[PDB]
Amino acid sequence: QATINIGTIGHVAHGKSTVVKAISGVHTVRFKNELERNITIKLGYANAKIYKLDDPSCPRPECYRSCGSSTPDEFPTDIPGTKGNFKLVRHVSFVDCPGHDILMATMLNGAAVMDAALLLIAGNESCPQPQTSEHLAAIEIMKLKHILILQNKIDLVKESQAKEQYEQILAFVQGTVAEGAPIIPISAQLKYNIEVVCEYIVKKIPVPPRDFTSEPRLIVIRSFDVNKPGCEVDDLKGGVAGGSILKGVLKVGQEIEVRPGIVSKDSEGKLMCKPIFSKIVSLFAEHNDLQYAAPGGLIGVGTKIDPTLCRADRMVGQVLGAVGALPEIFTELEISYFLLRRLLGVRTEGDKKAAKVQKLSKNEVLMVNIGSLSTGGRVSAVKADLGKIVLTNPVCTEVGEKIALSRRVEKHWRLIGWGQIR
Amino acid sequence: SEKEYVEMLDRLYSKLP
RNA sequence: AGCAGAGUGGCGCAGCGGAAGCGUGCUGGGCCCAUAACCCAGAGGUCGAUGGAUCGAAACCAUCCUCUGCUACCA
Domain CATH code at residue A65: 3.40.50.300
Same-domain pairing of A360 and A289: no
Same-domain pairing of A334 and A300: no
Task: Tell me the resolution in Å.
Answer: 5.8
Pairing of strands A288-290, A147-153: unpaired
Same-domain pairing of A365 and A296: no
Same-domain pairing of A126 and A60: yes
Residue A371 lies in a domain: yes
Please give the Cα distance from B15 to B5 (Å, whole number): 16
Domain count, chain A: 3
Q: b/e string for A274-301 if b means 16 or more Cβ within 10 A? A: ebbebebbbbbbbeeeeeebbbbbbbbb
Please give the Cα distance from A146 to A6 (Å, whole number): 9
CATH assignment at residue A264: 2.40.30.10
| Residue A145 burial (C-beta neighbours within 10 Å; 0-12, 13-18, 19+) | middle
Which residue from A292, A317, A310 is spatially nearest to A220, judged by alpha carbons? A317
Q: What values do phi and psi take at A110, rounded to 5?
A: -65, -45
Residue A158 lies in a domain: yes
Pairing of strands A250-251, A255-263: unpaired
Q: What values do phi and psi take at A265, rounded to 5?
A: -65, 135
Same-domain pairing of A237 and A191: no
Residue A212 lies in a domain: no
Please give the Cα distance from A224 to A309 (Å, whole number): 9
Nucleotides of C under 7 A from a protein CB: 1-3, 70-75
Of A321, A348, A373, which marks where a domain is finished? A321
In Å, how far are A46, A165, A192 from B15, measured between CA atoms? 31, 21, 9
Q: Whose CB is within 7 A of strand C?
A: A 29-31, 33, 45, 222-226, 228-230, 237, 240, 242, 282, 284, 300-302, 311-313
Q: b/e string for A190-226 if b means 16 or more Cβ within 10 A? A: bbbbbbbbbebbbeebeeeebeeeeebbbbbbbbbbb
DSSP per position, A48-92: EEEEESSSSS---SS-S-EE--S-SSS--EE-----S--EEEEEE
CB A24 within 8 A of CB A48: yes
Same-domain pairing of A191 and A244: no
Of A321, A356, A389, which marks where a domain is finished? A321
Residue A120 lies in a domain: yes
Q: Which nucleotide is nearest to A229 (CA to C1')?
A: C2
* Chain-centre distance for alpha carbon A179: 23
| Residue A47 burial (C-beta neighbours within 10 Å; 0-12, 13-18, 19+) | buried
CB A221 within 8 A of CB A300: no
Residue A88 lies in a domain: yes
Same-domain pairing of A12 and A138: yes
Report the amino acid identity of residue A63.
Answer: C
Which range of residues forms the domain containing residue A303?
Answer: 217-321
Of A292, A321, A350, which marks where a domain is finished? A321
Residue A209 lies in a domain: no
- Give first-to-last CA distance, chain A, whole Å: 36
CB A227 within 8 A of CB A246: no
Please give the Cα distance from A413 to A164 (Å, whole number): 30
Q: What is the dihedral of CA A151, A153, A157, A162, to 10 degrees?
A: -20
CB A277 within 8 A of CB A255: yes
The H-or-E segment that residue A133 falls in is helix A130-142
Residue A338 lies in a domain: yes
Same-domain pairing of A259 and A347: no
Please give the Cα distance from A178 to A139 (Å, whole number): 11
**Would you tell me how many other CB atoms lie within 10 Å of the CB of residue A385?**
10
Q: Which nucleotide is nearest to A311 (CA to C1')?
A: C71
Q: Alpha-carbon Rg of chain A, whole angstroms?
A: 22
CB A125 within 8 A of CB A151: no
Nearest Cα of chain B lies from the Cα of A180 at a distance, in angstroms, of 6
Same-domain pairing of A198 and A60: yes
Please give the sequence-ordered ranges of beta strands (E in DSSP) within A69-193, or none if there are none. 77-78, 87-96, 116-122, 147-153, 183-185
Same-domain pairing of A345 and A280: no
Same-domain pairing of A95 and A196: yes
Residue A307 DSSP label:
G
Same-domain pairing of A315 and A242: yes
